[PDB]
Amino acid sequence: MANTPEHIGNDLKLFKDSSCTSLKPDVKNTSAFQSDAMKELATKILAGHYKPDYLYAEYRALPSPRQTGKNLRIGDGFSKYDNMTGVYLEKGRHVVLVGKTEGQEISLLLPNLMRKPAEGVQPTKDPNGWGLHKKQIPLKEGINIIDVETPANAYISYFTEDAGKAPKIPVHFVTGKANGYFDTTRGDTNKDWVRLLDQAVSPIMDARGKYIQVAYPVEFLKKFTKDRGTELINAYDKLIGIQYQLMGLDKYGKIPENRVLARVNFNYYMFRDGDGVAYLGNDGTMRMVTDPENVLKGDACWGFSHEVGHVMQMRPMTWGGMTEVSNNIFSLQAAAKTGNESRLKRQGSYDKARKEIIEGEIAYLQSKDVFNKLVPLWQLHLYFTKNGHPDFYPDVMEYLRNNAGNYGGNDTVKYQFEFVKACCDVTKTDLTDFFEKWGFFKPGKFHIGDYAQYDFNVTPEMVEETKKWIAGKGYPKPETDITELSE
Ligand SMILES: [Cl-]
Ligand SMILES: [Zn+2]
């Protein structure tokens, strides 16, 4: 009764369709079955209480994270594990039945979320590194025999260009175990959450909200979240939603379908890579990020907002020198929306930046402090928020999505002037003086040290053409000196 493609293939003929969730009406017993896997399934069905949940599901294609990023001019650090199954695969040989693919590329992901450094290895210096290791198995239409060496939650990788059009692909983990998952968009409640954790067969529970996906250990979810899984997911959704709102993605119907992943790791306190945000699986860190109130406080809120803001910061607001500047517009907004302190206020940044840049008569580009560069960007928001344009950044980011050019490396300085034009046009305000005082219009050749090093050439013509363009609009000047705004 071995689970060979020939034994399994013969058995497939006994079920009503390729889902194998029901038997042909003349199949009364299991005497004709050739495979252990399909016989065991048919025995469940014949006994009248088969639960296909999770084990069998149909998977919808998502836009690739890189397409999503390109469309919005932002990063592609969205979840590769978005199509969670709620299926856990024990060590052994598994049978996975895939429906019609129409040649679509589709694979199975088995990440090692519980990977730890070897005994006596310093976690930060792990020779295996800090990345999320996984087995990736290409799937074909039909019978897939998959050898699992270490037990794993399963995730489907199914991404295309034109996701609304691609087929739904059925996948049946015949030999799997239903770990389940928590999904607030499905209507799951705290009752569901407690039951999920109590009956979990994996050390990892998968959960998602509107925008967040989390992959955290059951032990920490029970210890700290306990009861409040809905609140936890809502809190991460609030943090991400704050960025989408500031981006104007809600206003203009452009919230991406892709989730952002926050995961456990066993190497380091907190970091972000291409897979998303990672948090150390110890009591200290897990208390901060698996408790729904703690995740919205101070350092936890800032750290998450700061990192996600690297995915969400758009290229036209993130020219050279701006990598650690434009993402913190999100951090400041998230602090304002969660009742936390202003870090610009706490650092005395308005004063530090006015002294460094305005009094120092340097170019904005030459500023040596990423909080000082953040100051005018935040003053604009605080000003326009009070003076009749509450959708300031939402409209500016939409305008730049639609109108900004396409620049890389040393050419990215052109975005500085495009950003200035966008702010004027959106608000119908002549902001020449504000930007002049903050040194946006200083000509020269500037060498700027970000992660990359930039050589910007701001010519007198570039400055004059921007100023001419603004003057030509005939907008009113603000009544007050916006550079004087402080908290
Ligand atoms: Cl920071
Ligand atoms: Zn950063």
Numbering used by the authors: 20 to 506
Paper text:
Here, we focus on the mucin-selective metalloprotease, Amuc_0627 (AM0627), which is known to cleave between adjacent residues carrying truncated core 1 O-glycans. We showed that this enzyme is capable of degrading purified mucin 2 (MUC2), the major protein component of mucus in the gut. Of the enzymes characterized to date, AM0627 from A. muciniphila is unique in its strict requirement for adjacent O-glycosylated residues. The M60-like or Pfam 13402 (PF13402) family consists of hundreds of enzymes from organisms known to inhabit mucosal host environments.
